[PDB]
Enzyme design. Sequence first.
Site, PDB file in Angstrom:
ATOM      1  N   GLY A   1    -109.933 -67.204 -17.664  1.00 57.03           N
ATOM      2  CA  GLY A   1    -108.820 -66.646 -16.916  1.00 57.03           C
ATOM      3  C   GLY A   1    -108.935 -65.136 -16.703  1.00 57.03           C
ATOM      4  O   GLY A   1    -108.109 -64.560 -15.995  1.00 57.03           O
TER       5      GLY A   1
ATOM      6  N   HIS B   1    -116.072 -67.246  -6.725  1.00 49.82           N
ATOM      7  CA  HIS B   1    -116.245 -68.477  -7.487  1.00 49.82           C
ATOM      8  C   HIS B   1    -114.897 -69.154  -7.763  1.00 49.82           C
ATOM      9  O   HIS B   1    -114.813 -70.092  -8.561  1.00 49.82           O
ATOM     10  CB  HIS B   1    -117.102 -68.244  -8.744  1.00 49.82           C
TER      11      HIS B   1
ATOM     12  N   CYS C   1    -111.328 -63.488 -15.239  1.00 46.51           N
ATOM     13  CA  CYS C   1    -112.129 -63.115 -14.083  1.00 46.51           C
ATOM     14  C   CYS C   1    -111.317 -62.353 -13.044  1.00 46.51           C
ATOM     15  O   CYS C   1    -110.119 -62.581 -12.869  1.00 46.51           O
ATOM     16  CB  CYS C   1    -112.745 -64.326 -13.403  1.00 46.51           C
TER      17      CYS C   1
HETATM   18  C1  LIG Z   1    -114.132 -66.509 -15.084  1.00 45.95           C
HETATM   19  O1  LIG Z   1    -114.744 -67.582 -14.384  1.00 45.95           O
HETATM   20  C2  LIG Z   1    -112.658 -66.859 -15.314  1.00 45.95           C
HETATM   21  O2  LIG Z   1    -111.964 -66.220 -16.095  1.00 45.95           O
HETATM   22  N1  LIG Z   1    -112.196 -67.849 -14.562  1.00 45.95           N
HETATM   23  C3  LIG Z   1    -110.828 -68.323 -14.601  1.00 45.95           C
HETATM   24  C4  LIG Z   1    -114.945 -66.137 -16.352  1.00 45.95           C
HETATM   25  C5  LIG Z   1    -114.427 -66.666 -17.694  1.00 45.95           C
HETATM   26  C6  LIG Z   1    -115.375 -66.470 -18.876  1.00 45.95           C
HETATM   27  C7  LIG Z   1    -115.011 -67.328 -20.090  1.00 45.95           C
HETATM   28  C8  LIG Z   1    -115.057 -66.380 -21.283  1.00 45.95           C
HETATM   29  N2  LIG Z   1    -115.160 -65.055 -20.693  1.00 45.95           N
HETATM   30  C9  LIG Z   1    -115.460 -65.047 -19.404  1.00 45.95           C
HETATM   31  O3  LIG Z   1    -115.806 -64.063 -18.760  1.00 45.95           O
HETATM   32  N3  LIG Z   1    -116.340 -66.536 -16.142  1.00 45.95           N
HETATM   33  C10 LIG Z   1    -116.842 -67.768 -15.959  1.00 45.95           C
HETATM   34  O4  LIG Z   1    -116.263 -68.803 -16.247  1.00 45.95           O
HETATM   35  C11 LIG Z   1    -118.147 -67.810 -15.170  1.00 45.95           C
HETATM   36  C12 LIG Z   1    -117.947 -68.031 -13.669  1.00 45.95           C
HETATM   37  C13 LIG Z   1    -119.142 -67.535 -12.900  1.00 45.95           C
HETATM   38  C14 LIG Z   1    -119.530 -68.150 -11.590  1.00 45.95           C
HETATM   39  C15 LIG Z   1    -120.384 -68.366 -12.795  1.00 45.95           C
HETATM   40  N4  LIG Z   1    -119.112 -68.768 -15.723  1.00 45.95           N
HETATM   41  C16 LIG Z   1    -119.024 -70.094 -15.389  1.00 45.95           C
HETATM   42  C17 LIG Z   1    -119.912 -70.995 -15.853  1.00 45.95           C
HETATM   43  C18 LIG Z   1    -120.946 -70.582 -16.701  1.00 45.95           C
HETATM   44  C19 LIG Z   1    -121.072 -69.263 -17.032  1.00 45.95           C
HETATM   45  N5  LIG Z   1    -122.047 -68.697 -17.870  1.00 45.95           N
HETATM   46  C20 LIG Z   1    -123.281 -69.204 -18.148  1.00 45.95           C
HETATM   47  O5  LIG Z   1    -123.727 -70.203 -17.579  1.00 45.95           O
HETATM   48  C21 LIG Z   1    -124.075 -68.485 -19.223  1.00 45.95           C
HETATM   49  C22 LIG Z   1    -124.698 -69.497 -20.179  1.00 45.95           C
HETATM   50  C23 LIG Z   1    -125.137 -67.590 -18.593  1.00 45.95           C
HETATM   51  C24 LIG Z   1    -120.111 -68.287 -16.560  1.00 45.95           C
HETATM   52  O6  LIG Z   1    -120.165 -67.089 -16.827  1.00 45.95           O
END
Ligand SMILES: *[C@](O)(C(=O)NC)[C@@H](C[C@@H]1CCNC1=O)NC(=O)[C@H](CC1CC1)n1cccc(NC(=O)C(C)C)c1=O
Lengths: 305, 305
Positions: free
Chosen positions: A143, A41, A145
Amino acid sequence: SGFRKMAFPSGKVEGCMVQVTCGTTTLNGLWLDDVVYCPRHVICTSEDMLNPNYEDLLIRKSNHNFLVQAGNVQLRVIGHSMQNCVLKLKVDTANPKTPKYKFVRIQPGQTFSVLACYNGSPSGVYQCAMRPNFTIKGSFLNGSCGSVGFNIDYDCVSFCYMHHMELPTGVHAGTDLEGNFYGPFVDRQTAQAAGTDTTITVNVLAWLYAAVINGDRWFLNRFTTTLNDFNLVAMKYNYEPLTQDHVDILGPLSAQTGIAVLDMCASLKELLQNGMNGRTILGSALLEDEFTPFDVVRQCSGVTF
Amino acid sequence: SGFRKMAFPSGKVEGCMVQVTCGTTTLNGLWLDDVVYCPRHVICTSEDMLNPNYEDLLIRKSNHNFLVQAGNVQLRVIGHSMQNCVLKLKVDTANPKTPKYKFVRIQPGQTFSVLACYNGSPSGVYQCAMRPNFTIKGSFLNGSCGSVGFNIDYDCVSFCYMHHMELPTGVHAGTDLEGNFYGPFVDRQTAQAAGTDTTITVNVLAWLYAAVINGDRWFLNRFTTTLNDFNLVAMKYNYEPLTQDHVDILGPLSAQTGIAVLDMCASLKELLQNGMNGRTILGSALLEDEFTPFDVVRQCSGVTF
Ligand SMILES: *[C@](O)(C(=O)NC)[C@@H](C[C@@H]1CCNC1=O)NC(=O)[C@H](CC1CC1)n1cccc(NC(=O)C(C)C)c1=O
Ligand SMILES: *[C@](O)(C(=O)NC)[C@@H](C[C@@H]1CCNC1=O)NC(=O)[C@H](CC1CC1)n1cccc(NC(=O)C(C)C)c1=O
């Protein structure tokens, strides 16, 4: 003596953590030999998230789109590939600090240490468990992830988790290192529920043995119980059913402490039916189900890596 | 989001851990530059323990009595010296992995990560705090001694603890890295009591802010209180008195969450007077006082090292 929640050392995994940028989005990746693994992603924008077609989002990417930074060392990507929900990036250099390692897919109830990273740089470390609903009670900011979950077997580092998502509940879902999600979750911004989060009975029982061993033993009870009988009372308190294989596992504890499994199951049952009534066990005012038999062994034996 | 007890990474400290044998007794030591630090009680036998004269036990030792093993590399001791309750061993080689580092003496209430070692080899890692009674609720088996407590400030590793003793209660006492004990404890096998273990009020308050931040906010209360008023209720629940300096410290949390310090002190008071009545905060069925304001900042901001 004393008993705490503790992780394996990070050391070995620190030197496998790298930063991966594609588009704007930068996150963490894991560099073993001449391959860097990360959540696919990374190729998505905040809009793509809502319903990405990864195949098609990926065709429009090429090796040079993928910036991989090891502190300052920039590694050259000479190949790339999507495996399930991870991306594998062939790079020119092999990691000099690559330890012995394996990709494992843990069972629900199994524990592992997590080294939380921001921008390839590790911020801290904690232990958590694959909850029966296939989530984990972690601490993950944006961040985070691509940070990973691991066990160590003296030398060999076992990779059980890569982090991807937060769920509405303040809990997290992610992948093994072959990129298959634990649980039914998908890497998309859609509505997703955890499911019923049950207690890992077998792990609770070991935590009790650990208590005994440390001279918290007030909760010990004259009663014994049967396996079927105890499960009736478990199911109703939302506890994972207990198998013969769970008893087997608790044998060496059972032996050492002189307390039979089912007598420990008796003592537990009464704590369900009667609560803790104020008191604490190993300082915890509830029951702790994020300790494996093995975890307890390790910590009441002093094993090293 | 989510919130857990987590330690700094160990990595940096792992490469400073060594094994030290003298007589039979082997324990852990810490190797920085061309010096290896360890508890002086390495020169004692199980009998010497009961009332050693360290000066005199030491005269009968010479450099070659002290075996120092770095995995397999044997370092040559070319000098030795007792500093308070530690021993400093000049050796021929300087540690290639010596990080930036300092010796700190933390205040009671301050937290630090501990990397527990057996035979120079690190078994695991956890965070704990210098309790107001100058003990720590650790997990230390025999062979754990000389293991250390540390903080990290991006690069710089601050050494706050070296482990020495277990106390009757299943709790631990030890030294700064200049070898002075925290609390009134002595390195001798005599009867020693902890003293009254109070709760680190300021740290509890931050844990609440962290709760708020994570959408556990049920315990928030319309009432406010005064500083003097709240301390009356604290003292009686054995809580460390709260100073203006503690409020200062909680400012940035206060600001961010929109909740005034004294309103958070109001919400706390009612939890003392009324218990948790079954509910949980951040999954903990009691109040957690082993989180500094700073700890919370870090974890709700995602700092790295
Ligand atoms: C990860 O994407 C990251 O660190 N990217 C730089 C990570 C960050 C989250 C924010 C707080 N803690 C975390 O784990 N996860 C997300 O941003 C994920 C990415 C995956 C591909 C979906 N993400 C993005 C959008 C929306 C969601 N969650 C939901 O829609 C929930 C309402 C189910 C999500 O987890
Ligand atoms: C340490 O000596 C070690 O690991 N050596 C190899 C360490 C081991 C303890 C066993 C369980 N957890 C531990 O921390 N501590 C001791 O053995 C110490 C040594 C110091 C110099 C005294 N030790 C030795 C003898 C007796 C006591 N304690 C008591 O007498 C209490 C009853 C107060 C002790 O801590």
